[PDB]
Amino acid sequence: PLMVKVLDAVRGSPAINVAVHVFRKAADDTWEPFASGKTSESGELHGLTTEEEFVEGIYKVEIDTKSYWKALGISPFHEHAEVVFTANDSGPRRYTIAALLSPYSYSTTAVVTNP
Amino acid sequence: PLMVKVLDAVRGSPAINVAVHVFRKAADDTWEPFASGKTSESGELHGLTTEEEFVEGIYKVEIDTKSYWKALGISPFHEHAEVVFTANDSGPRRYTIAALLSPYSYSTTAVVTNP
Amino acid sequence: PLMVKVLDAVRGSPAINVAVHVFRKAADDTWEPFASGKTSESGELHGLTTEEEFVEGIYKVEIDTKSYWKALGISPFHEHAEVVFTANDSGPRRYTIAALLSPYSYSTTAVVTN
Amino acid sequence: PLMVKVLDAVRGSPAINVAVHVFRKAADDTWEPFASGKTSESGELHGLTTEEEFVEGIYKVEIDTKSYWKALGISPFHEHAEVVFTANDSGPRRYTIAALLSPYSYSTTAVVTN
Ligand SMILES: Cc1cccc(C)c1C(=O)Nc1cc(Br)c(O)c(Br)c1
Ligand SMILES: Cc1cccc(C)c1C(=O)Nc1cc(Br)c(O)c(Br)c1
Known part of the structure; x- marks a missing residue:
């Protein structure tokens, strides 16, 4: 029910091998690690x-944009791109979090569907 | 080798039933109808x-954004969104033209791959 | 009542010395030159x-994005960027057309105020 | 040396009276309050x-996008928008952090000049 997609606006290509870390806010208000991948x-x-x-x-x-651009040997502006949202509060939904990256800019959108 | 994808940044959803017209510049410099769909x-x-x-x-x-938003009963800013590019000049490529729509804004990107 | 602003998402800068041409749609559906500048x-x-x-x-x-990128040694995707809209006196009176450029993407918004 | 600008892609307007909080990362990796305003x-x-x-x-x-949308009668997706970056004296001296808001999307760029 959660998918992350990242595109590269400089290369005109998918952004491959981008590290993504997902956290969930705990009872004590800390960010608990939830899942991660590339x-x-x-x-x-x-x-x-x-x-x-x-x-x-x-x-x-958390989309690790700096690590992405540094791995390509480029010096980018942002440390990362974060997308923070409440999920599933009206029951289960499916979420796609999409991001489009440039060295000094990013854009994100969500596609939320009810299965 | 050509795909168009449109998302709605207000609804958080795909943009369904968006009319798309593709033209190709002719020898005489006019835009010739090439293909269309929804x-x-x-x-x-x-x-x-x-x-x-x-x-x-x-x-x-040409992504018919005004017609899209009017069909939803919203008064948008733009008449359409255009994406104009040279294709296949180094041989065949596959192109995805993606657009993200809001009533007063849009963003587009291309993903170009070599099959 | 009309201002155009262009930014560069690769360099994190204004996009300087970019040619911009404005046209008005004529009765016969052709685009008539209206204003231009850099x-x-x-x-x-x-x-x-x-x-x-x-x-x-x-x-x-019409924003001449292709020349902009080539002057920076970058091959870009688009021939140019276009922003086509209706001016309506029932809405606010000043229009800012802003664009944000990357080689394979552009984003634009309208800021319309009184 | 730091300015924040917020625009609304639904209304085609500036995003007015939006709360913005700036933090600096401390030695212990916590976020210390630095500046804020609307x-x-x-x-x-x-x-x-x-x-x-x-x-x-x-x-x-940190931009309080959620309050902004709710004051307009819109349920938005995000809790807030964050822009996290490094200030570097080897680059230009003035930073503009711009954001463009929609209910389910945001876009941001940096304009860094001397
Ligand atoms: C076109 C665009 C504008 C602003 C932000 C983003 C993330 C995009 C974008 O690349 N969206 C996008 C989303 C999905 Br889901 C896709 O399968 C593709 Br192709 C593009
Ligand atoms: C942050 C953004 C996202 C998508 C598209 C655009 C054009 C922008 C942007 O850079 N807007 C912007 C608009 C004005 Br008016 C400004 O004075 C600045 Br500085 C940035």
């Missing part, structure tokens, strides 16, 4: 979680 | 053309 | 028109 | 800091 050759990251495990909560999807 | 329930428009027909040229992908 | 050091292009000249109608703002 | 009628927030105070380091700009 984008594939398609720019997509599938299989982060399950419908059982992806309960209601406030989630943070 | 986005599906996924926001994607597949099958516009073929690798035989999608020759080198300058192409214009 | 963005300044701030990425802004002021003084394109006046209230008296800027009547309701459909306008196209 | 955007003006132009969507801009000026005067957050001074050159003397704005030393190299990692900063976070």
Whole structure:
């Protein structure tokens, strides 16, 4: 029920091998590690979680943009891109978090569907 | 070798039933109709053309954003969104033209791959 | 009543010395030249028109993104960027057309105020 | 040396009276409050800091997008928008952090000039 997709606006390509860390806000207001992974050759990251495990909560999807651009030997502006949202509070939904990256800019959108 | 995808930044959903017209610049410098279609329930428009027909040229992908937003009963700013590019000039490529829509803004990117 | 602003998402800067041409749609559906200029050091292009000249109608703002990128040694995807909209006197009176450029992407918004 | 500008892609306007909080990363990796304010009628927030105070380091700009949308009667997706970056004295000296808001999307760029 959670997928992350990342595209590269400089290369005109998927953003491959982008590290993504997902956190969930705990009872004590700390960010607890929830899941992580890397984008594939398609720019997509599938299989982060399950419908059982992806309960209601406030989630943070941290897209490691600096590490991405540095691995390409480019000096970027941002440390990361974060997307923070409440999920599943009206029951289970499916979420795609998409991001488009440039060295000094990024854009994100969500696609939320009810299965 | 050509796919168009449109998302709605207000609804957090695919932009369904968006009309898309593709033109190709003719020898006389006019825009010749090349292909057209509508986005599906996924926001994607597949099958516009073929690798035989999608020759080198300058192409214009016109995304009928005003018609989209008016069909939803919203008064938008832009008449359409255009994406104009040279295609296949180093041999055949596959192109995805993606757009993200709001009433007063849009963003587009291209993903170009070599099959 | 019309200002155009262009930014560069690769360098994190204004997009300076970018050619911008504005057209008005004529009765016969052709695009008539209306105003033009080059963005300044701030990425802004002021003084394109006046209230008296800027009547309701459909306008196209064409931004010469291809020349911009090539002058920076980058091959870009687009031939140019276009922003086509209707000026409406029932809405606010000043229009800012902003664009954010990358080699394979562009984003634009309208900021329309009184 | 730091200005934050927020625009609304739904209304085609500045995003007015939006709360913005700036933090600096401390030695212990916590976020220390640094500056805050609300955007003006132009969507801009000026005067957050001074050159003397704005030393190299990692900063976070948090924009209270959720309150903004709810005050307009819209349920938005995000809890807030964050922009996290490093200030580097080897680059240009003035930073503008711009954000463009929609209910389910945001876009941001940095304009860094001398
Ligand atoms: C076109 C765009 C604009 C602003 C932000 C983003 C993330 C995009 C974008 O690349 N969206 C996008 C989302 C999905 Br889901 C896709 O399968 C593709 Br192709 C593009
Ligand atoms: C942050 C952004 C996202 C998508 C598209 C655009 C054009 C922008 C942007 O850079 N907007 C912007 C608009 C004005 Br008016 C400004 O004075 C600045 Br500085 C940035």
